Ligand binder design. Structure first.
Ligand SMILES: Nc1nc2c(ncn2[C@H]2C[C@H](O)[C@@H](COP(=O)(O)OP(=O)(O)[C@H](F)P(=O)(O)O)O2)c(=O)[nH]1
Ligand SMILES: [Cl-]
Ligand SMILES: [Cl-]
Ligand SMILES: [Cl-]
Ligand SMILES: [Mg+2]
Ligand code: NA
Ligand code: NA
Ligand code: NA
Length: 326
DNA sequence: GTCGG
DNA sequence: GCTGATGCGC
DNA sequence: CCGACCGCGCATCAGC
């Protein structure tokens, strides 16, 4: 929060470029800059000082100068007048409404929350649930509730089959005092990169979590990625807990360490890590790390036996989860 | 928007 | 149906 | 300059 004014401005420019401009590389460029500035341990006192950080160039440099002078950015102040872009910015906050869908709706005069509640007949399934719980999904989750939710999930998974292993990742695994949502990695020994010895492996888990009314809704659901809603249960005559987004990813047991690296994040850390893999001649995904040949075709899975082996392959010394929150 | 080649 | 492209979100 | 910018699961759509 040392440069909180600057990083907010860049995050607002990043969401603008992403939601309105549909310019995904400007969005990342602003995010990376927001990120390197966020971890810089001095109160930034000029744009040129900031341009010294990789990912701050000339244009962000001018903007930081202006912000530091007036406490505002005109480019932003305008963008908020523009009713079309503030309408688009708003609709994208409903889960399942992305930049294209938002601009489409706006083009039909569906611009506000009341607009969306009239026209649920014009929303796919994900969008329906995203509007249903629109408010709940912007509340964070206190870590103590993450700990409750963890316990239900791990105990309920233990009851389906004692050989499941469920790890909660995301910001929770990075030590966060709060989390936007819950991310669960699931492994079962009969699902490997070699065979799928048992069917409905993930389905059994969500079915059981539904049985105890922890999972309340589904956004999408395949045989390895579930994406939906959960809610802690409350005792007698207390206000309901909010509903929470939950994602569960079934990863092959022998690919646990790439899987847990991917799901621990952050997304930006993942991005910077995989990028630097490429400059060392590796490609990292949630399953494997492989070398690149001279043609750039991915070779075959290098053998991994811990998170740290992946970091070793690519010239980085290990970084504990709590230091991956870029 | 920023970077490295 | 299947395959491939896109949208969306991770 | 200027070309590349992580990698992929699920839903949904178009074409065959
Ligand atoms: N390679 C890659 N990985 C990505 C990307 N987006 C999310 N992820 C990853 C890493 C997350 O932590 C993880 C969960 O995705 P997430 O959106 O729940 O992020 P998170 O780190 O848990 C947030 F801090 P929180 O939700 O707690 O507020 O999945 C991406 O664009 N590329
Ligand atoms: Cl772009
Ligand atoms: Cl792979
Ligand atoms: Cl840690
Ligand atoms: Mg999360
Ligand atoms: Na720089
Ligand atoms: Na959205
Ligand atoms: Na998530």
């Amino acid at each position: 929060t040392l440069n909180g004014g600057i990083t907010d401005m860049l995050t607002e420019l990043a969401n603008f470029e992403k939601n309105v401009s549909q310019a995904i590389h400007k969005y990342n460029a602003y995010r990376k800059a927001a990120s390197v500035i966020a971890k810089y341990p001095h109160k930034i006192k000029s744009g040129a000082e900031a341009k010294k950080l990789p990912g701050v160039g000339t244009k962000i440099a001018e903007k930081i100068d202006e912000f530091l002078a007036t406490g505002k950015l005109r480019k932003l102040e305008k963008i908020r007048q523009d009713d079309t872009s503030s309408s688009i910015n708003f609709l994208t906050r409903v889960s399942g409404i992305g930049p294209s869908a938002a601009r489409k709706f706006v083009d039909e005069g569906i611009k506000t929350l009341e607009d969306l509640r009239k026209n649920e007949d014009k929303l796919n399934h994900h969008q329906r649930i995203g509007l249903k719980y629109f408010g709940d999904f912007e509340k964070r989750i206190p870590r103590e509730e993450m700990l409750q939710m963890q316990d239900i999930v791990l105990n309920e998974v233990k009851k389906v089959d004692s050989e499941y292993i469920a790890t909660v990742c995301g910001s929770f695994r990075r030590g966060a005092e709060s989390s936007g949502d819950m991310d669960v990695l699931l492994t079962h020994p009969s699902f490997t990169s070699e065979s799928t010895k048992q069917p409905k492996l993930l389905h059994q888990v969500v079915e059981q979590l539904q049985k105890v009314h922890f999972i309340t809704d589904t956004l999408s659901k395949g045989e390895t990625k579930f994406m939906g809603v959960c809610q802690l249960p409350s005792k007698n005559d207390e206000k309901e807990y909010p509903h929470r987004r939950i994602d569960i990813r079934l990863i092959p047991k022998d690919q646990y360490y790439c899987g847990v690296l991917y799901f621990t994040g952050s997304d930006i850390f993942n991005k910077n890590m995989r990028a630097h893999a490429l400059e060392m001649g590796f490609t990292i995904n949630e399953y494997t790390i492989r070398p690149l040949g001279v043609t750039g075709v991915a070779g075959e899975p290098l053998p991994v036996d811990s998170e740290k082996d992946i970091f070793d392959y690519i010239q980085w010394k290990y970084r504990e989860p709590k230091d991956r929150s870029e």
